[PDB]
Subunit: 460 residues, 4 copies
């Protein structure tokens, strides 16, 4: 019996070739393999994992396994799996349920296949999640499983928000580590990852020249910062929208004009509030917010003909694709690339000029239309994931008495010392040489020679 | 009015012309003037101020005065005063003791003139400092004055470190606000300020082409980040040194090669530990650390002939200028520009090829050889200073009983809401338009429509 | 009824046609020529042998030539550069095309032969459109009687032009040519900005490597090397540049690059001792951009850092000594057009060996081999020039001229600056750009007509 | 020695210090000194020179003198002289008539002092010019002097246009070399020089932050290209205007929005044709064209309040400053910085908000408000000048028989081989290493191993 489901198992050899390359690009993660090999700190760990089934995730999975864990895996997005990576993991004997181009029903089924082994709840004791979907399903549908789970390690900004809401409401059942907010995650992956992979995805989907054209990036947090750079470095004229004036100040100082889709920044919900002159000149819009309906129906109506629309935030509801499905006709160009014809719902003229190009049906475009962030960037994120798994598994929350569990429910980050140790391995991967403080210098600035080098207030 | 000392009072009209321009470049600060003029929240405040006597400081001073304060002012660096600014402030009837090109004895005398009025301690009740020199003098020499002081507002990273050391040792006598760590200060002034003003100062001092040449920036905190950009945007080939691997990871991802002056980063004090091949190719070295002896004697010996050496950190001991004074002959090119001849102490050949060019005798180069950060950047820093002064003055720490002082004796930052309000005014100064969240969107991400928009953990 | 073609898979035609319809919207200069000249049919009677990368962009070029009255027979000028959906869409429109991605060399030559011959005999060709000179060479060496009836050659690329100029110098060029490459809207658009767009694109598609923070060496700093260096630097690479031309090297220095040679003091003595092994041992990526031979040589390949990526974006694969690598080292295909080359020996390799290089597109032009080459909106410039060049030579009717008049016209020329400007204006309008009109006084002041041309022929832009 | 006029001879020692530094930054020029010292190829040359009396020109002058020439010198702009450079040249016994801040009458008088020695025409036999003013004066007022002059070497685009017009009309009396169109001049000086010195000048004059603000650059030739980069690299949002669609295409591809000051690009001279919405958002306008009235009266009226206006083309008539003198009130901020009050001609309110800031009264801003291009860039231009002087002086046009003069009366550029030799010295100055072709490679591409490497048609 094959305890997996993937698109095509014959892609395994290709995937394995790419894993071998990726190992060479992931020194922090491979360093953890070597360092913790002897101890087997994840011996006895049974990890439910839900995160984009890419080559990078493959190296993460095999690191967890190399440190003693067993896992059962699914992707956290319908379009993000690399089928060769899924195949290589399945062929190594690891249960994985993932393919590129899942339906929503298949997506839920894949998560269910990780949770259930041979038709009963798996004896899971750890969770690794990216976006909170697996966390939500366990809490909603398998609450008894959480009695035996020691913790959740959550990858992404959106997932963390959802955890913090559960904690505030008293509905979170196990502790978590916010992996996102290690500096080697948030200020590496979220920013430089998107810098690498946004323009990549747009080129693969459309092959559009970007230089000389007008872009609007909605948001200027870590993803928006990286996204804006991805485009500006290509020669786009990028405008930035924000609701956060500090982030907007950064965009101004970084050389971007800060604009709103709405007249005076006020959305009244009508077309009259749209800055039609602005949107009529935009060739590309990218959403980066983790919020809802930031590229709304009225904005879509006002966009320049033939504009590209995409989202690089975690969930597709940043863009009102439901409005587009209800009202406009979709013409598939190729997979994950649709022309959306604004002439009506029922059919289209093949030579119509009044369309938008939507990438990945509004799902995470970097992963949907390309391969997401590169190995050398994901090295940081995933070294943090491994450290976080070790920490929570060692803490054994599920074995605490009921009264003490109540006291130990938290959402925490990894210590700065570990964040530094990850960064050092990343730096060495580039051939970088960090200088060691003399004793006198360390005394002068008030730190130990080995670090940590900054107070916890430091923002980098 | 005679209660001042400046280089040349006849420069006042020029200074006033420049203050009128700077007011138009400082909307956050001017907005505070207009908003608080009626209420006079600083009525009764008597502020000892020690910060670079520039045009920008002039607008700060006159804002404090417009809100009801009286001040006595000095510069916190011997080369940083703009004499026209000092003159304009003196001519407005405000006690100021500052000029460009002070001796160290004059520097101390100027601070003493703020502390003493007519030969006796002034009835000061507030302190505004940049670097901690005034704060140190008050604690060491005028402890009775601190009994009646409500707080200190400290501008810069180095000054904050000194406060935090005092707090750790139980020697801090009054509460402080860390103005540096507002995002609209640290991630504006320290970074973009240096981006603007480093290349500016080097051009004014040397008129050297930077494009195509090799630079080494020591440090990659906010100043090193801004400094590196200042140089790279001019076409320099910039290498970065760091002791902090997180900051080094950022430098790598930002497109810099990370190097150490020392073989394997080990600074053992020996000549042989210097990477002679590296230093022999460097045309410019810039120190940005806030630490001691980061451009040391052995590094200076190994630098390429005709290299420029400068420091943009707060204090001159980043570079071992004492070694250069003791051993090498100094030839003044023009004010704040010296050729340092490595051939010997006693005289030099006017056509010697083996020299370095030192800017501002190792003191902060942006202020020493140019005019420091631009008005529109200092607007952020100084709007924070004003808000910080208001907050501590209203809290009236000096008048609290002993038991209540114990609860308030701390080093704090301004609330994020105020940091955002400053940023908004900066954004509007650029013509930027921030978007207003809908109530549904604000609920979705868990914030009020008016902000604050981020949790206190957020790093931007 | 139409069968006069050979492509990978005709069922890709609908996809290709969807992409052509998008590309038309990205190519205003080319589409402007279609609309302007449709009525007049200036290429009526033209029979064009075409040899250029069978991409979507070439598809729009082909259909423009056809829309203006031409008939064509087409092949690609590179074994890896065809987009199969584009080839299919062209075949389905009834146009003879012989092209697919992943040709062998024998197939490549056969495809060119299929354009030249129709039903086993020389086609009644009267025009040539070429990219690199291979078709031009075959006609001159093997089909001289066909050249008697050919009015001209329009040549796309720097390499091809060099070959034409050599023929002209030797008195062996049989028909006139237009150097399309040296329109400013080609050379300083396509060769530079095209590579800026498509180099990093190809490297990402092939390897998915992070480029930021890593060390690159770009060999050459002409238009391709300039664009290539920018492609990498804009991604955060630390880029070093090599050049033999000191003017181009001066530009690289001023542009913010360190200028280095693979050889100690720039002198190759042919031995491994002349290699700067310390330099090459730190390089993660090398890119050749020269149009020259063996600029990434065997000794350089031996000295490169383990796991370095090697690629070429010049016209021909001999920039890199891949023959040395085939003879001496073991090739492991990662996926199509991506090979690990194991430096441990010829016969087999360890799957976990660390001492390999990654070669893209077997050393053939990487932007077209591992991605889709330049974007439509850039190729618009190049291809509007191709169309204008075809119109000009076809109208001149060189083949029909008497001997004495042929002597006067047998040359390699560029398009007039006025036309180069007209192409540029349509490109600018495509971006929504608004050019200012000179007043009469201003035009007089600088000595030009209000409509242009705006610069003397000496101007370098 | 009294045969000079400069602002202040006591600045000579400072000038000499700066010349000694500049020599180290000018390897091509110093290489020419060493190479040609023995031959003294300019022995007997008597050169009238008219070009910006900067430190860089000082090194040029002393190179000509070191190769045997005698000279008489003036500046080609009223604001471009560096008084320390003029002083150092006078103190070396060389006739120079130049100071910063000349009136137009003084400017003409200075040129006349070069032409006349001891009250009568000097026995000049060579001319070095920058802009054509000296050339025009010789042709119009001293035609008899041209009978004994062997040639003109002309530095700049505007000067060359004027020569080519003279040649076309049959009014040019001596041959010329177009120094501008060496690649090591035009594509070095005109572009990278302005990149270095435009932002420099704006900072020195105003100390304005540039990041985040809106600029409009009129022109995108070599100067406009370099100017646009100067601003964009600082984080300005730069828009570009052009009449040349090829240059406009380059601006688009380089990442700029191309706009016209006039609606649809049509300049009918009416206020109605101005794009007031566009100009109302511009904080900085820079003219780069070498044309007339490209920043016209109606544009000046429509500019955003407090916009900076400047010109970096050769002559001040790019901007309609005559209109501003006739209609608006000028308030000097400091030398070469004026607020132009749009409220009327006769007086102004010191606190008026409706003004523009004009730099250098519309004269070349880089030289007027800073020091022009850096030594290492001018090295290229001036090595070309020296080679051009050698070539024409050795040809001895004035002494040629009539039939041979006819053949040599032309405006020519230097051979590409020499352009390459200059570039090589510049590259070596950066520590750059050029590769030598193998014999097989040289054969393959059809060039000699030593060069020239490109055909004359090549545009770089
Ligand atoms: N695609 C990827 O590979 C990838 C990588 C990292 C994170 N993410 C996801 O991207 C999203 C953003 O993450 P982040 O770390 O940048 O978060 P963040 O909190 O740093 O930034 C989001 C920004 O959006 C802004 N914003 C919110 N509503 C807005 C509106 N209506 N208009 C304009 N701006 C608005 C906020 O002010 C904030 O600055 C999340 O969903 C996260 O999980 C995706
Ligand atoms: N000149 C200006 O206008 C200006 C502006 C703002 C702040 N400052 C001053 O600049 C200094 C730096 O401030 P900051 O905000 O960047 O502080 P920071 O803590 O953000 O950055 C300093 C960096 O230096 C690094 N460092 C320390 N010792 C080092 C060594 N031996 N080698 C290499 N790197 C080393 C640290 O790791 C740290 O990242 C302080 O003195 C501050 O007061 C100057
Ligand atoms: N891949 C593409 O899409 C594409 C696009 C346009 C042109 N091209 C091709 O790229 C090649 C280059 O074209 P180009 O327009 O840049 O030509 P170019 O003449 O402008 O530039 C080539 C440069 O290579 C330099 N060079 C030569 N030998 C060298 C060596 N041994 N080491 C270092 N530098 C050396 C030359 O000095 C020259 O500056 C040609 O083969 C051309 O056909 C490819
Ligand atoms: N300040 C300096 O140090 C310096 C340096 C080099 C040259 N220059 C001078 O700068 C000027 C420009 O020189 P260049 O080499 O760039 O010349 P150029 O011919 O390369 O460029 C000038 C550009 O202006 C454009 N133009 C003309 N009229 C225009 C209009 N009405 N609106 C918009 N664009 C218009 C032209 O199309 C052209 O592209 C000349 O006067 C030259 O002598 C000054
Ligand atoms: N123009 C300026 N006026 C006043 N302070 C300045 C200026 N430029 C930089 N600074 C300050 O210098 C400090 C370093 O001592 C920084 O914290 C910064 O706030
Ligand atoms: K990837
Ligand atoms: K300033
Ligand atoms: K393409
Ligand atoms: K200068
Ligand atoms: Zn996820
Ligand atoms: Zn200070
Ligand atoms: Zn070709
Ligand atoms: Zn001049």
């Amino acid at each position: 019996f094959t305890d997996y489901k993937v698109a095509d198992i014959t892609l395994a050899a290709w995937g394995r070739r790419e894993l071998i390359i990726a190992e060479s690009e992931m020194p922090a993660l491979m360093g953890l393999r070597r360092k913790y090999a002897g101890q087997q700190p994840l011996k006895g760990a049974k990890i439910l994992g839900c995160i984009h089934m890419t080559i990078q995730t493959g190296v993460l999975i095999e690191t967890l396994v190399a440190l003693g864990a067993e896992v059962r895996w699914s992707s956290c997005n319908i379009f993000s799996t690399q089928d060769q990576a899924a195949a290589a993991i399945a062929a190594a004997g690891i249960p994985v349920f993932a393919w590129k181009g899942e339906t929503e029903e298949e997506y839920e089924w894949c998560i269910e296949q990780t949770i259930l082994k041979d038709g009963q709840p798996w004896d899971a004791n750890m969770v690794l999640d990216d976006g909170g979907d697996l966390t939500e399903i366990l809490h909603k549908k398998y609450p008894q499983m959480l009695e035996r789970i020691h913790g959740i390690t959550e990858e992404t900004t959106t997932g963390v928000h959802r955890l913090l809401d559960m904690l505030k409401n008293g509905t979170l059942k196990v502790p978590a580590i916010n992996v996102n907010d290690s500096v080697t995650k948030s200020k590496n992956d979220n920013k430089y990852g998107c810098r690498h992979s946004l323009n990549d995805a747009i080129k693969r989907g459309t092959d559009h020249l970007l230089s000389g054209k007008q872009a609007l990036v909605i948001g200027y947090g870590d993803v928006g910062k990286g996204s804006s750079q991805s485009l500006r470095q290509e020669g786009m004229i990028v405008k930035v929208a924000e609701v956060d004036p500090i982030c907007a100040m950064q965009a101004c100082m970084d050389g971007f004009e800060v604009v709103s889709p709405y007249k005076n920044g006020i959305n009244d919900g009508t077309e009259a509030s749209i800055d039609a002159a602005l949107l009529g000149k935009i060739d590309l819009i990218v959403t980066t917010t983790g919020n809802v309906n930031v590229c709304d129906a009225n904005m879509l109506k006002a966009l320049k003909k033939r504009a590209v629309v995409c989202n690089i935030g975690h969930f597709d509801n940043e863009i009102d694709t439901a409005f587009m499905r209800k009202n406009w006709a979709w013409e598939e160009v190729k997979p994950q690339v649709h022309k959306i014809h604004r002439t009506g719902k029922d059919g289209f003229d093949a030579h119509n000029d009044d369309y938008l190009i939507l990438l990945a049906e509004g799902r995470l475009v970097n992963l949907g239309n390309a391969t997401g962030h590169p190995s050398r960037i994901m090295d940081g994120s995933f070294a943090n994931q491994v450290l976080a798994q070790i920490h929570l598994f060692e803490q054994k929350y599920a074995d605490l008495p009921a009264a003490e569990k109540a006291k130990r429910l938290s959402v925490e980050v990894l210590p700065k010392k570990l964040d530094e140790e990850v960064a050092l391995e990343m730096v060495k991967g580039f051939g970088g040489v960090v200088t060691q403080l003399t004793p006198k210098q360390a005394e002068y600035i008030g730190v130990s020679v080995e670090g940590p080098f900054k107070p916890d207030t430091y923002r980098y």
